[PDB]
Amino acid sequence: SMAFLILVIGNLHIPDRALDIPPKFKKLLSPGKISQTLCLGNLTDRATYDYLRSISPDLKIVRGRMDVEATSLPLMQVVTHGSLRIGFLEGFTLVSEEPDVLLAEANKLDVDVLCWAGGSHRFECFEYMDKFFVNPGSATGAFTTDWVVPSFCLMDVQGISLTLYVYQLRKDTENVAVEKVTYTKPV
Amino acid sequence: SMAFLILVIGNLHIPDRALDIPPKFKKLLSPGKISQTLCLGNLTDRATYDYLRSISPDLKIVRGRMDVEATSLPLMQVVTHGSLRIGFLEGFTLVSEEPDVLLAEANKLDVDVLCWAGGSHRFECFEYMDKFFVNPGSATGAFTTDWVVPSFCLMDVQGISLTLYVYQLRKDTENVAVEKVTYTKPV
Amino acid sequence: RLLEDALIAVRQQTAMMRKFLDTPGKLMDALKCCSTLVSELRTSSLSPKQYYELYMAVFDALRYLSAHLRENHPVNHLADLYELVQYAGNIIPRLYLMITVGTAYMSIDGAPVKELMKDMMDMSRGVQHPVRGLFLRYYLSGQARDYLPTGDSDGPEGNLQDSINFILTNFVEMNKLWVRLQHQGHSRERDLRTQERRELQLLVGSNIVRLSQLVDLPTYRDSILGPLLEQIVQCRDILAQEYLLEVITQVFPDEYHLHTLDQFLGAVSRLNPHVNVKAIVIGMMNRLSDYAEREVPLYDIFFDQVQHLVQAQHLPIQDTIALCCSLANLSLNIYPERLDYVDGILAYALAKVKEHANSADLHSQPAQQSLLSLLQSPLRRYVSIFTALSLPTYVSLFQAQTYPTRRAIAGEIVRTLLKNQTLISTPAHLENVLEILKVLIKEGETDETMEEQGWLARLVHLIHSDDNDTQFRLLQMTRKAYAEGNERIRTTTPPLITAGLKLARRFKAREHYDDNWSSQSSSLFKFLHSAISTLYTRVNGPGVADLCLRLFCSCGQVADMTEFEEVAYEFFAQAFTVYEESISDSKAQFQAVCVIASALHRTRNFGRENYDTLITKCAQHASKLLRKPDQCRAVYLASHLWWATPIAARGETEDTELYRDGKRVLECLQRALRVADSCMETATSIELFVEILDRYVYYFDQRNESVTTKYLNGLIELIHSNLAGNQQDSASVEASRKHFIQTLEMIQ
Amino acid sequence: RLLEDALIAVRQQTAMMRKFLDTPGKLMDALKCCSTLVSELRTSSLSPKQYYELYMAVFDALRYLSAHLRENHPVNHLADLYELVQYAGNIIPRLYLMITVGTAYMSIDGAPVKELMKDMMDMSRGVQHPVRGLFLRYYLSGQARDYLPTGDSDGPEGNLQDSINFILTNFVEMNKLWVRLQHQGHSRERDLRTQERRELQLLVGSNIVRLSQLVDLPTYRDSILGPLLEQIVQCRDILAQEYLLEVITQVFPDEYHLHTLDQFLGAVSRLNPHVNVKAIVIGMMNRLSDYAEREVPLYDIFFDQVQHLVQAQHLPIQDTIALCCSLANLSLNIYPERLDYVDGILAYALAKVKEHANSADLHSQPAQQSLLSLLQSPLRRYVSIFTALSLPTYVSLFQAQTYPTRRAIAGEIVRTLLKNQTLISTPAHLENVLEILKVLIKEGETDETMEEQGWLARLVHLIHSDDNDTQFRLLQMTRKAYAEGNERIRTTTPPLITAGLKLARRFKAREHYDDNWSSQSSSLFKFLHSAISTLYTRVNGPGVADLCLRLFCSCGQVADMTEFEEVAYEFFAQAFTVYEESISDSKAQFQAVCVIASALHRTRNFGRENYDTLITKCAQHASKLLRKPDQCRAVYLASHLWWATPIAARGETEDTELYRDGKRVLECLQRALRVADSCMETATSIELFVEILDRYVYYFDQRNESVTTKYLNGLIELIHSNLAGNQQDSASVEASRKHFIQTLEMIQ
């Protein structure tokens, strides 16, 4: 639709670890571009929250794994555009992943697109069981000794279709690299 | 002493397990007979309060274990008649029914006679550790926690001596039965 | 004054008359003076009371003269005296003298009785003044009302019929005079005239009294009431109809009236619309009410005819209701239990009352007051008020009572249903009582002060009257009926919890006669969970925690006894949930958690794996409160969670045998000591250490080997070092010393 | 009235003068009309503006006269005309005529110009009335403007001295008159007089402009400023001093001033404090500052003179600080940067100001406002304030600020230090920064990152700039700089934790450079434990538990990564200890146990004695939670302690495999089944059973021999029996059906 851009980002630690996303990314997330932002919490500061509501006319916030106090928020949220029900998460609430846990979770939620950013926070994606599974990686690039290029994603849902734009700040000099991905729900 | 008759009653459980004085007992306890009433709780309402007030010209009550909404009343009370000191409580501000614990509480309160109405809802009395222990049974006939004799007492203090009269509605059929018990304080 | 001047003249005339009566041959002089005296009664200027007083004074003097004559004839005679008294110049004296001599002749002369009596009555028709002729007829009545030509005649002149004729003719003349009283004097003194007539009503009714010493029922029918009814209906006045009909009814026998009831009702139909028919009809119905309360389908005949009469009128609604109340009084008193008659009152009055009631508000209306008295009449007259509940539409008409008064009447009835230690309420009676309850509870300081303590106790008692499983179904429907909001169930449901406590046992007393009794217990415990969850809607209240806490402990015990322990554990976990949401006042949590301790201190069906786990939970939440005294008190009580204590340690899981987990008990007591050292107040710290030492004495004497004499030695040394060495002396410090001395005495 | 009437008369006289000027030999008549016109100037009732305007009209007529004379001499002459014109009766016309004829003589014959100027200059000693003499001397200056004998002469006899004498003498006489304007007239017109002086100041300054279009720099030094300074220092007037000095500065070039700087500064030293020297000095000093910012030992001389002025000038404290601000701006323009000067500014200017600031209390006082502007002035003028930070004594001014302003300024600086990235700081400058931070933190919505939270994050960032050995020292000195208390370190230390996690790896990334990497890790782990234990002290807040748990777990992972696991196990046991001692809320416990599970799901390298011990403790902790739903959730997750999932299930025997203790996993699943049976809910229990069956399919495929397809099949029949036959329909029940259909699809 391009009227409803969804920002997908993670690994916040602001200022808990770092200062900002790339300036070029801040302008790519500047107000007037995104219609709704789905953030995964654990900010931890208020200025970034104010920035985030101001980025899009629709700010949606979910419960975070560092957000032990604001438990009232759900860990997942659905919005509907045409025929799609959309779930998203970070993933630590799972204990394995491989095929049965994703299928079981999809069945519990009955969704079509699933987003997560597990503690490894490294990009991958796959389609499975007529449902869609998305890992944006470590968007802000937070580090850990697990087995990241500054990045974020934009999503555009229309009907049974989802359009994903992945933005990366790649190294040779730091260069912004953009990729587009589209998803359409199978029947 | 005791030209000032003191009514001793317990395990009333109004409306908890039983609701009223036996009619023959209310008439034995009718106003103009009792000068002071020591009630062992579970009245619980203002109506029961005013009636009990009407029974005797000087009503002294302590907090009850289910009398949790009546924040104004004291939790425990001691009275002295001649050379005898008499303390009373329900047992909820007491901690258990162990002999040493009762003796220790009696020693802090400087009392010789203790009235209580535990879950047995059975009249009994015994002397132990030079002190006097009185359970009036259930003045209302409240059911027991054990595997039924309605009873109350009319304690009589004279000097260093206490005479206890227990009135019971005993079964052969409801019959009013009176028993006398005497307690004399150690020197 | 006029009265007094006349009374002076009367006493003067009585004085010379008596001096003449003394002297033989002065009798004629006594009569001349008597005529001069009676001339005073010829005045018409006296007030009614004054004329009455003058008549009475002259009457008593006339009685002296009349006795003198009634003695003179019995002893010699006086010739032609009946003729001689007709010589008198003044007509009122003359006629009084003829009556006096007539009665003297009647005493002396039996043969002339009919002719002389008939003559005196006919010639007394000459009196052209109503009042003077009426008073004259009293002189006649005192003289000769007792001598009439009657059954006392045995064959000569006179018979009971002649006396009946004499009195009926006297009635007609007195009635013509009685109406004529209405028309004498000026028209604007009508109320004064009616007052005078009310004064003179006894004059008419003395004849009725004389009639009631007379002939029987067929003679009553043909020759008294028949005549009396034509006159009663055609006289067309109000004071006479009401007075004369009530006097007839009391004075004549009602056995006679019964044989003539229909004649009475056909007379009641024969009256003016403009006479005070409402008063006569209300008074007749009230008399029939008396015919009912002094404890031929009279009901149907009188009932239906009374409706025709009311339709024949257009009545005030209040008057109609007062007649309905008297109709109720008649049916209730005549038919306390003929439910078909009572229902005919219920049916054949009430809807018609609603159409006749131009139903604006009617609370302060006496029609309302009467409708209450009417409804009370079943209630008062019932041996069994249940019989009111047997009327299908007795209760349903209470809906159609006006509504403030629906509260007043429904409250008063239900209270009366409670002062009587009343009987089984069957489902049918449960439904009618519940409908009454819905009116009380619906639509929703209690300016009612109703209702509940004797109300719940009575309700719980009578619930038991129906069979116990049904009682659960009834309790469940009542539980839906308790949709009234947040300030009822707190005081109403815990008694229902006890009703379930008895029913769970009633199931267990069939544990070898049923095995779904356990399943029935399962249904009741699911009910308990649902009803408690219903209370959790009522977050606004205190003790919401306390009551639930005691209910869960009670239910845990019942779950043990019903072996239905699976829903006990859940209830206890939910009780912990209650522990978390219920933190609002610091002191209140300390007392409540102590209550939690004591309930656990009886809580005995948890398997030890569950119990000790619970014990640790209790100890942690205890160890997460605010202040060190309370923290100490809870810690020393968690020592009692593992030892040969509490009531829990005499368990249905402990088989009365005690835990005695003395190693853990020692660890708890040592932790209590660790908290106790950090009181940072010398006196209270030492007092508590003495109490803890006493707890050590407790476990030593309970044979807790982990509680060693070395711990006692180190604690007594620390108490000795502090007690004297750094305590500022105080009443508490002295008590702590006395306690320590006692504790040394116990340790020997 | 008078001014316009006079102007009319002036126009009449100009008409008659010019009509005479047309005729040669009417020149004397033209002069008579010109004198009659200038007679209008004999009124003194005109305002300064009105008298000036009349002067302008007479001046304009004089322009006609002066051109006429400068034409008469070119055509014939009139002998002795300069003398002959001195016969005029009116003195002001006569002297204006003297100037006019004089200039005509200078135009006609250049040889007497020098001689004529001495005569004309001498005769200007007459008119000492300030207004009239000033206007006359203005006429003289305009007429005699172009004829001066000098090195710039016109060809008359005369050297640079004759013009210097003419202009200096003309300056002194007009300045004497101009000051006399202050005095002339009457005493209540002082403001009018000051107005007159401001009006006539151009007359005085035209001489200075004329001097600058005259003699050069050595002549300026010897024979211009000397006279000018003598007048400036000797007037003790205020209006003349500001005007005359600014005119000197502007009109003569600064190349000239530079040759006279010491003469200027010797004038700068005598400034009389009650003379409005402050305004003159601020405008001159500001000009020199501006001179500096157009960007002879002036710094030393002027610095010293400023001290002499301050000893002379003692001004209200705000005024003194504002002068200090301008002095700071001057120093900024002069010398912010060469370090000996920067220190001399700090001590002998800035310290001297602080000692001289005998200040009343001032944080909101404008003296503070100026002191802030003053201190900001180094900061603004430091384009590279880093070079300001190359003072060790950079902080030293913070010593001299009051605490409110030390905190306010340090905040503003640190904020500016956040709008910028501050450089890689050397170990030493980190301490200086720390002292600044200590001033910020001590004594004391922090959306400014108040006081340094995003600043702490940057600091942790900058730690990375140096290498591991320097980093260890920096981290230890910063950790000392973390003596700050319980309400601060919560938000500041976890970034230090990350600084240590990177430094521990930076030590490990030296295992082939120093095998003390284990020892380096050991020192860092003791340092970190000491800092976390510091946190443990400060239990007063939420997350104090959370944060300590996360840091201890994190250190456990670093110990894993470094294989420095010996200090890992202690930290994990201590974390369990934290769980037991400090965590209460059941829901909070659920989150904590899930994070603990996930952290184990990152636990790999422990020796099996430690590892397996942790696995069993963890299984116990799983078996020690609170709620039955939760009891199930923990039990199915403890299957993962044994199963072929997750990292926690790696034993050092499994060879990269996860325990796959499918026997134990089955025992766990049976425990989950026993917990499921005692849940007392149908839909979620069945849903959970389906999830467990899917987990069974998982364990079948992950090779649980104890998980068999027959068990799955029997469970699907039990699910089939439950799904339809006892599930009350709900979104969950449909999901459970969909899940069961999926699970059947999985079993194929």
Numbering used by the authors:
A (entry chain D), B (entry chain B): 0 to 146, 153 to 177, 181 to 195
C (entry chain A), D (entry chain C): 12 to 306, 387 to 535, 554 to 857
What does the paper say about this structure?
In fungi, the only known non–BAR-containing SNX adaptor is the SNX3 homolog, Grd19 (13, 19). Using local reconstruction and three-dimensional (3D) classification, we found that, for both metazoan and fungal retromer:SNX3 datasets, the arch is asymmetrical. One VPS35 monomer is more curved than the other, and the two monomers interact via an asymmetric VPS35:VPS35 dimerization interface. This asymmetry causes the arches to tilt by approximately 22° away from the perpendicular relative to the membrane. Arches are assembled into linear chains via two homodimerization interfaces—the asymmetrical VPS35 dimer interface and the symmetrical VPS26 dimer interface. The core trimer arch—the conserved architectural element of the different retromer coats—forms a scaffold that can contribute directly or indirectly to membrane bending and which propagates curvature over larger areas of membrane by oligomerization.
The core of retromer is a trimer comprising vacuolar protein sorting (VPS) proteins VPS35, VPS26, and VPS29. Here, we elucidate the structural basis of membrane tubulation and coupled cargo recognition by metazoan and fungal retromer coats assembled with the non–Bin1/Amphiphysin/Rvs (BAR) sorting nexin SNX3 using cryo–electron tomography. The retromer core retains its arched, scaffolding structure but changes its mode of membrane recruitment when assembled with different SNX adaptors, allowing cargo recognition at subunit interfaces.
